[PDB]
Amino acid sequence: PVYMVYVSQDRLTPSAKHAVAKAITDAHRGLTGTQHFLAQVNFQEQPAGNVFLGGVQQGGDTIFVHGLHREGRSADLKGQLAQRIVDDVSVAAEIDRKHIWVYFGEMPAQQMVNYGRFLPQPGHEGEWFDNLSSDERAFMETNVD
């Protein structure tokens, strides 16, 4: 996946970011079986005060996670995945769950690419990896924590 994580500048240190990225990568990997290296977590920082709720300028605690997935998973699974992102990001970032927003968007995997290659179905995988080139697998492999 790609997780776009919109946060305010400075609210997360480099170690909070890694912590926030590990909590999200673990949830997605744990609940969908997708391998570690296929989860991209992309932090988008903006100055505090660029977030408004009900037209009221916010401080710098709001966290919005926009997850871009392949279609084909159940509402159950997606429900569990989002709840675990709320819980586990709350822990990692040391924020109150009342600051955490999470939207999952789904596209067909036919029109999705990571590492220059078209993704599998969630009902494939493994064999998509083993069908990649060895230099391709190798570069992917350096991306596991």
Add this chain to the structure above:
Amino acid sequence: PVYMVYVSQDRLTPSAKHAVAKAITDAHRGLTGTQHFLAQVNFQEQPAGNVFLGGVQQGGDTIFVHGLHREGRSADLKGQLAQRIVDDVSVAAEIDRKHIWVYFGEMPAQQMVNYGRFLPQPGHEGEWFDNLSSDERAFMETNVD
């Protein structure tokens, strides 16, 4: 909703950003009936020259509103709301309508989280607010302008 508003650095003063978040919120509240505090407006500033139109580097006037919505509203209502954002952001930003881009993407409510709580179906916002705990209600209410 979550409205990501892509503007150029310093195109919108702090005062201009507040009036724009206010316009967007008031349009979405007035046309869908969701409470103000559920309306998030997240400004994404980037230096001028990061927008290209047909390969022509642009100055800092272009505004892209990306609206993230729950599924279930008519094409009619979505039409009216998009037009009202164009007009109302134009006044609030004092910007000709020709610079304004607005896209609405929709996702099932069951995979969408708001203040750490899953959203109801559209039209069911009052029963879902009443169901919230007292501290959660009070906290949301602070976010109303």
Add this chain to the structure above:
Amino acid sequence: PVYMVYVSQDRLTPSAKHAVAKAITDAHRGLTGTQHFLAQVNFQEQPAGNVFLGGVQQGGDTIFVHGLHREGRSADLKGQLAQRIVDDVSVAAEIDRKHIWVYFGEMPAQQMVNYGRFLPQPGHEGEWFDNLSSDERAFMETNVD
């Protein structure tokens, strides 16, 4: 279309950004027939190290392109468009393809707005353009490279 291009700060020179913008814009025009000026490319820069892959902090080479399209085109055409973006952005940015991530999200053209006006369906740009007002046509024509 709107192409949000996520890259680390200073990874792209101002001329490489033009070349990536041109590469995407000519890909989209070539295969969809949409006029040059309807292609928006919006660079979203972040400091290097805000991207994680499998929990591993990255340098500034990763490029994620999130294309936002109208519904109505075939899986096959979107496959060719995605592959072409990978190939030609690779060239224009001097970045190996394996750093490049491409996702296409689709929406009904009835809830999408370019230059203050609603898009037509994916067959009817010419007649849509011809029926615009003469100042709008003139403004759109300026954004062609």
